[PDB]
Ligand binder design. Structure first.
Ligand SMILES: CC(=O)N[C@@H]1[C@@H](O)[C@H](O)[C@@H](CO)O[C@@H]1O
Ligand SMILES: CC(=O)N[C@@H]1[C@@H](O)[C@H](O)[C@@H](CO)O[C@@H]1O
Ligand SMILES: CC(=O)N[C@@H]1[C@@H](O)[C@H](O)[C@@H](CO)O[C@@H]1O
Ligand SMILES: CC(=O)N[C@@H]1[C@@H](O)[C@H](O)[C@@H](CO)O[C@@H]1O
Ligand SMILES: [Ca+2]
Ligand SMILES: [Ca+2]
Ligand SMILES: [Ca+2]
Ligand SMILES: [Ca+2]
Lengths: 4, 74, 295, 307, 295, 307, 74, 4
C-alpha cells in the first residue's frame, strides 16, 4: 500500500 | 408543452437515482459479504465451531455489469 | 401513451425495499460488530498452572494449595524455576513427582542430555508419562540438607499396587554423574529392589543388581559397573550397576508379561522390580515421587 | 419531440433491472443475517484444547532443541527470569529447528485487526492438539505479545525468518540475520538486515514495483508499530481516516503503509480485488515483492532464532 | 640351807617372764589378724567394664556413657551379648571397633573359625591388637537396616594419619561367606583402596584388587576370585579378590618398609592401603570401626 | 635321805635350761613381731595385674577352645544368660583343653581359710600377667565362686578332673566323669562318679588307709560344703570347737572331715607334722590316698569340662 | 625339820609345773612360727611384694628335744 | 582326717  | 415533456425528466432523477444509489448500495453488499465471510471465519479459532460457506462472489460481478449495461442506454 | 400512472406504481416499489435494505444492512453491521466482539478469545485450554510457587511440592501444599496438578517450584540453589506435577492428599502432603509410566506413550530410550533436562509431558490430571530431569531432581533433593523420601509406587496389570519407600533420598550433581544414594529402605510391600536381588543365576547377582550408590547411565554415557553397557543394551537411562534389579525407566511392555524372545539382546529390559514380580513382568504403572522425610 | 417511445419499451426495461436486483439483495442479505445469527448461536461455546506441557524447557526454542526437544510442537520457555514463562510454538524441523514462532497465519481462525494492547500482550492460539495425541503438535494462528517479541530480540544477536505459501502450493523465504524490536516505550521500532531470501527484501528495500519516493514509503526497516487506535505510520496528516493501520486492516510496522503486510486480512483463495476490501486498500496477507498488492497468502509465518 | 632357797624367789623370775611371753604371744596373735585382714583381697585389676549396655557403641554413648573403653553390646537379632571396645568423642559419637593393629603383637595368620568368632585382646586403653569377629561384625552391621559407616583410620611410621570412610557398611551372614558390601566411598585423605588400585603391572589390576562385593577368605576357606589362594599366600584373613589393594589384616612389618626379599612368596602381604602408601609400606597403626551413618 | 642335793645340782640346771628357752622364745617372739609389722607395710600397696581380655568368649572354656581360643590363659565366659560374664582360667593344653578351672593351688599366694560368703562368691587371683606379655597367661590361686561352680555343673552332664604335683616333681590325676554341686539352698551338696585315675578315689571311696567305719567318714561324695562359720560336716556333736572346717583350715565338702582336702593349708616343702598345725589336725593341701594325711602338695587344681 | 624335808619336794612341784608350761609354750609358738609363715606367704597375692623369709624350725626341735631331757629327773 |  502506497500513498502519494 | 406540459403533460409529460418535462414531467418525465423529474422522473429521470427517479430512475437515475436508484440506478446510481443501488449501484453503490450494491458494492456495499460486496464489501459486506466479503467482510462477514472473514469475520465469521476468524471465529473458527475462538468458538466451538465455525460455518462452512462459500461466497457466491461471481454473481455480484454479474449484477455488477447489468448495472453499466443500463447506465449506457438512458 | 401518456396514460402512464401504472409505471409510477412500480418505481415506488424499488424505493420501498431499497430503503428497507439500506436499513437491514446497517442494522446487520451492528450485529457483525457484536459478532467480532465475541470472537476474540483463543480456544479454552484445559491445562492450566496453579499460581502458588515454592521450593518443593510440599512447600506448596503448606502454602495452601489443595489440588494435585501442575505447579512451578523454585528450589534453593537453582536458577530458572521449573514446572512440575504435584500430588496432594487430603491430609495435606505434597508429593513432587519426577517419573511416571502408564501406557508406553513415551520412548524412554533417550540420551544423556535428555535425561539431564528431562523429557515427556506433564498434565494436570497426571495421566501422562515423563521424566522430570536428573538435573532438576538433583536441585530438588539437595537444599540445606532437609531429607526427602523416595516413594516408588507400582501398579501391575491387575490393579494390584504396592510401594517402596527410601529415606534420605538424594541425587548427585552432574559432576559425580547423577549417582543416586539413600539412607535406607523405609518400608513397603513392593520390596527393596534397589538393594539388589538374588536373581539366582549367580551369587554375585544381588551384589551386582543393587542400585544404592550407582551413577546414572545412558547409552551415550556409560557409568555402570558392567564390562559392557547396560544403558545401551536394556535401552534406557538409569542407575545401572551390573545392570539392575529395579528398572523403572525400562521398556514398556503391554500386557505385562514378556520373554527372552521379545527382547533385543536376550536380557530383561522391561519396567521391572524384581523383589515384587519376576524379571519378566513389566508393570502397567510406575511412579517415582519425593517428599520431605519429616512426613 | 419524439422521446415518447421510451416510456413504452426503454424504461419498462431500464426498470426491470432494479427489480431483478433490489429483489436479490433484499433476499441475499437475509442469508447473511442468517449465517451470523447462527455463528453467534455456535459461539455460546468456545473451542477447547489441552496442551499437556513437555518436560523440557529453556530460555527459548533454540536452547530447547539443544536440550533434546526434537519435535515441532508447543513448548514452554522463559527467556528472562524477570518474567514468568509463557507458552510458544517451536519449529524443530524447518532449517535445523530451534525456531521460535512470533507470528503465524494458515487459515482464517484468528482476527488480526486488533487494538494496540492486544498486540502488546499477544493473542491467538499458540497450538492446537494434534489429531488424537495429547500434545499440541499443531501450531495455531497467533502473535506472541509485542513486549515478548521485543525482549526476545533485545537478549542477543537475533536472526529473523519469514516464510509464506501461496494457494497453488509454492513457497519462498525472507531471512534477516539481524532483527530487533525496541520496547513499548520506543513504539516497538523494528530494524533488520542481512537479507538472504527468495521473496524479495520488502522490510528493508520496499516494493519491487514502486519507483523512487513511492518505494521508500514502503520500506519497513526502522518503522514504528501501528494499530487501528495508535498511529505511528509514515503517513503524516491531519486527516484521521488516513492511517495505514485503519486501512490494511491490521497491526504492523507501518510506514505510509507497506510493501509487505502479514497480520493483514486473510482473504480466501489469494486472489482479491479493491472493490472487495473494506477500505479499498491492498489490505490482506500480502508480500508485494512476490505477488503484488493483490494476493493474500494461504500461509505466512514469522519465526526467530539467535545465531 | 635356808640360803640356797633363793630358788623360791629365783624360780618366780622365769615365771615372771612366761606371762610376759604369753602377753606378747597374744598382742601378736592380734597383730597377725590385722594382717590376715589386708591379705584377703585379690589384686586390683586395671581392666574393667562399664555397666551400660546397648545394641551398638553409639547406642551406649547416647545412653550417657562418656569414656572410651570396654563395653557389652547386645545387637538385635543376636543371642549372647558380647564384649567390645567403644570409642567415644567429646561430641558424643560412639565408634565401635572391629579391628586394631599397632605393634604386631598378634599373629593374624589365623583360620576361618577364628576369624568368625574373633581373636586377640581388648583393653580399656585401646592399646591392644584384635579382630572382633566376622560373625559379631555381621550382627552389628545388620539390624532393621539402619546404615552404619566404616571408617578406616591408618597411621604411618611418622605419626602421619589418614582416614577412609565407607557408607552403608555391612558384612554378610556366614551363609554367603562374609561378603563385605558398601554403598560408596564417603571420603578421606586415605584414598579409596577397596575400589581397587591401578597397581600398574596389568590393566586388570584395579578390577582385580577391588574389595566391595568380595567374600571373606582364610587359608582354610578360599573364596577369592583368584585361581590359587590369596588367603594362604599373603597369610591372613580378608576379603580377597585377585588378592587385594587393601590388606589391613596383613603381616605386621616393623619399620614400615619391606621388599619382595622379606616376603614368603614374593607377594606384598603387609598391612597395606595402596591408594595412600605403596604396596611395600605397611602401616604402623590400623583401625577399623563403625558408626551409624546418620553421624 | 639326801634329796636336798637337787637343791644343789638338779633344780639350778633345770632353772638354767628353763630360763635359756624362755629368753630364746622371747627372742623369737619379738622377731615374728617385726616380720609381721614389715609385711603389714609392704601391704600399703596391693599387687597389680592387667589382664586385657581376649576377643573370643563362650558359655565356658569348652565352647571357647571350640571357637578358636587355643592358648591357656584367662578368658571371659557366660554360661547362663541370667548372669553376667565372669572371668575364669581356661586350660587349653592339658588333656585336649576346654578345661575350666574351678580351683587351683601352686604357691602360698592366697588364703583359703575363708568364710562361707567368700567361698560362695569366689576369691583369689584368676590369672596374672605372663612375664612381659599383655595377657594373663598364668593362672593364679583361686576358687571360682561356689554359686558359679554349682551353676556350671547344673547346666549339663559335667565331668571333673583333679590334678596335683608333689614337691619332688611327680604327678597324679583323679577323673570323675560325673560331677555336680547343688545350689546354696542345698548346701552346695557335692556328688561324683566314674573315677578314672592314679591318685585314688578319695572323694568317693575315702582314705585307703582307714578301715571300715573309719574310712566311710572320709568319703566326700554326697557331702555338704562347710566353712569355719557354717557347719555341715559329718561330724555331729554339741561341742562347737569340733568342726572339720575350723580344723583342717579351709572350706570344703567335709564329712567328719576328709580323705582329701584341697583348699587346705599350703605348707611349704610338703612334709609337715601335727605339732606344726594350728589345730593338730592334718590340715593342709592333702590327698591321703596318695601321700597320707601328712603331706601338703606343691600344686593342686580342680578343673571341669562338659563331656 | 620343816623348811627342808617337806618344803623342798614342794618347790620342785611348783617348778615342774612351770617346765610343763614352757613345753606348752614351745607348742603354740612352733605352731605360730608356722602360722605366720603361711599367713605371710598368703600375702604374696594381696599386696605389692611378700617378705622373703626363713623359718629354721630346727632350733625349736633342738630346744624341745632338750626340754624333754628334763623328765628322767622328775 | 577322721574323728572316732
Ligand atoms: C515512478 C513512476 O512510474 N511514476 C508514478 C507516478 O506517476 C505516480 O503519481 C505515483 C503514485 O504515487 O507512482 C509513481 O511514482
Ligand atoms: C500518465 C501516467 O504517467 N500515469 C499515471 C497518470 O495517468 C495519473 O494521473 C498519475 C496520478 O498521480 O499517476 C501516473 O502518473
Ligand atoms: C585300723 C583302723 O584304721 N581302724 C581304726 C581303729 O584302729 C581304731 O579303733 C580307730 C581309729 O581312730 O577307729 C578305726 O576303727
Ligand atoms: C587299733 C588302734 O589303732 N588303736 C586305737 C586306740 O589307740 C584308740 O585309743 C582307740 C579309740 O579311738 O581306737 C583304737 O582302739
Ligand atoms: Ca561399562
Ligand atoms: Ca499518520
Ligand atoms: Ca581361590
Ligand atoms: Ca559338725
Amino acid at each position: 500500500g502506497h500513498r502519494p | 408543452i406540459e403533460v409529460l415533456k418535462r414531467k418525465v425528466i423529474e422522473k429521470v432523477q427517479h430512475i437515475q437515482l436508484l440506478q446510481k444509489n443501488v449501484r453503490a448500495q450494491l458494492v456495499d453488499m460486496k464489501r459486506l459479504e466479503v467482510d462477514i465471510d472473514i469475520k465469521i471465519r476468524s471465529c473458527r479459532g475462538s468458538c466451538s465451531r465455525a460455518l462452512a460457506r462459500e461466497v457466491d462472489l461471481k454473481d455480484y460481478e454479474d449484477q455488477q455489469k447489468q448495472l453499466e449495461q443500463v447506465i449506457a442506454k438512458d | 401513451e401518456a396514460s402512464i400512472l401504472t409505471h409510477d406504481s412500480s418505481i415506488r416499489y424499488l424505493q420501498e425495499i431499497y430503503n428497507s435494505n439500506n436499513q437491514k444492512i446497517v442494522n446487520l453491521k451492528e450485529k457483525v460488530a457484536q459478532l467480532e466482539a465475541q470472537c476474540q478469545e483463543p480456544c479454552k485450554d484445559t491445562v492450566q498452572i496453579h499460581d502458588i510457587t515454592g521450593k518443593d511440592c510440599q512447600d506448596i501444599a503448606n502454602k495452601g494449595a489443595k489440588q494435585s496438578g501442575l505447579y512451578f517450584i523454585k528450589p534453593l540453589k537453582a536458577n530458572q524455576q521449573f514446572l512440575v506435577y504435584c500430588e496432594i492428599d487430603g491430609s495435606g502432603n505434597g508429593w513432587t513427582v519426577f517419573q511416571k509410566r502408564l501406557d508406553g506413550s513415551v520412548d524412554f530410550k533417550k540420551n544423556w542430555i535428555q535425561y539431564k533436562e528431562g523429557f515427556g509431558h506433564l498434565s494436570p490430571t497426571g495421566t501422562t508419562e515423563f521424566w522430570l530431569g536428573n538435573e532438576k531432581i538433583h536441585l530438588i533433593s539437595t537444599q540445606s540438607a532437609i531429607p526427602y523420601a523416595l516413594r516408588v509406587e507400582l501398579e501391575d496389570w491387575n490393579g494390584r499396587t504396592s510401594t517402596a519407600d527410601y529415606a534420605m533420598f538424594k541425587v548427585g550433581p552432574e559432576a559425580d554423574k547423577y549417582r543416586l544414594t539413600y539412607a535406607y529402605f523405609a518400608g513397603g510391600d513392593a520390596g527393596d529392589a534397589f538393594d539388589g536381588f538374588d536373581f539366582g543365576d549367580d551369587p554375585s547377582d544381588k551384589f551386582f543388581t543393587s542400585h544404592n550408590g550407582m551413577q546414572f547411565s545412558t547409552w551415550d554415557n556409560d557409568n555402570d559397573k558392567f564390562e559392557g553397557n547396560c544403558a545401551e543394551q536394556d535401552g534406557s537411562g538409569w542407575w545401572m550397576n551390573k545392570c539392575h534389579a529395579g528398572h523403572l525407566n525400562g521398556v514398556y511392555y503391554q500386557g505385562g508379561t514378556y520373554s527372552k524372545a521379545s527382547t533385543p539382546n536376550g536380557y530383561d529390559n522391561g519396567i521391572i522390580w524384581a523383589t515384587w514380580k519376576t524379571r519378566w513382568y513389566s508393570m502397567k504403572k510406575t511412579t517415582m515421587k519425593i517428599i520431605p522425610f519429616n512426613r | 419531440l419524439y422521446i415518447d417511445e421510451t416510456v413504452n419499451s426503454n424504461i419498462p426495461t431500464n426498470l426491470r433491472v432494479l427489480r431483478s436486483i433490489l429483489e436479490n439483495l433484499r433476499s441475499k442479505i437475509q442469508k447473511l443475517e442468517s449465517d451470523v445469527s447462527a455463528q453467534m448461536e455456535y459461539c455460546r461455546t468456545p473451542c477447547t484444547v489441552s496442551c499437556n506441557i513437555p518436560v523440557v524447557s529453556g530460555k527459548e526454542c533454540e536452547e530447547i532443541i539443544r536440550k533434546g526437544g526434537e519435535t515441532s510442537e508447543m513448548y514452554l520457555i522463559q527467556p528472562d527470569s524477570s518474567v514468568k514463562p509463557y507458552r510458544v510454538y517451536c519449529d524443530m524441523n524447518t532449517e535445523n529447528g530451534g525456531w521460535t514462532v512470533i507470528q503465524n497465519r494458515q487459515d482464517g481462525s484468528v482476527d488480526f485487526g486488533r487494538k494496540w494492547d492486544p498486540y502488546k500482550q499477544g493473542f491467538g492460539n499458540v497450538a492446537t492438539n494434534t489429531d488424537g495425541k495429547n500434545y499440541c503438535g499443531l501450531p495455531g494462528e497467533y502473535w506472541l505479545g509485542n513486549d515478548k517479541i521485543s525482549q526476545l530480540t533485545r537478549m542477543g544477536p537475533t536472526e529473523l525468518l519469514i516464510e509464506m505459501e501461496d494457494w497453488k502450493g509454492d513457497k519462498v523465504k525472507a531471512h534477516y540475520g539481524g532483527f530487533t524490536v525496541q520496547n513499548e516505550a520506543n513504539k516497538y521500532q523494528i530494524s533488520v538486515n542481512k537479507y538472504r531470501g527468495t521473496a524479495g527484501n520488502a522490510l528493508m528495500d520496499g516494493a519491487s514495483q514502486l519507483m523512487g519516493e513511492n518505494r521508500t514509503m514502503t520500506i519497513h526497516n526502522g518503522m514504528f508499530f501501528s494499530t487501528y487506535d495508535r498511529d505511528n505510520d509514515g503517513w503524516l496528516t491531519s486527516d484521521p481516516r488516513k492511517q495505514c493501520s485503519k486501512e490494511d486492516g491490521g497491526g504492523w510496522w507501518y510506514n505510509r503503509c507497506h510493501a509487505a503486510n502479514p497480520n493483514g486480512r486473510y482473504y480466501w483463495g489469494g486472489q482479491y480485488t479493491w472493490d472487495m476490501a473494506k477500505h479499498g486498500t491492498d489490505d490482506g496477507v500480502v508480500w508485494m515483492n512476490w505477488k503484488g498488492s493483490w494476493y493474500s497468502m494461504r500461509k505466512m509465518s514469522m519465526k526467530i532464532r539467535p545465531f
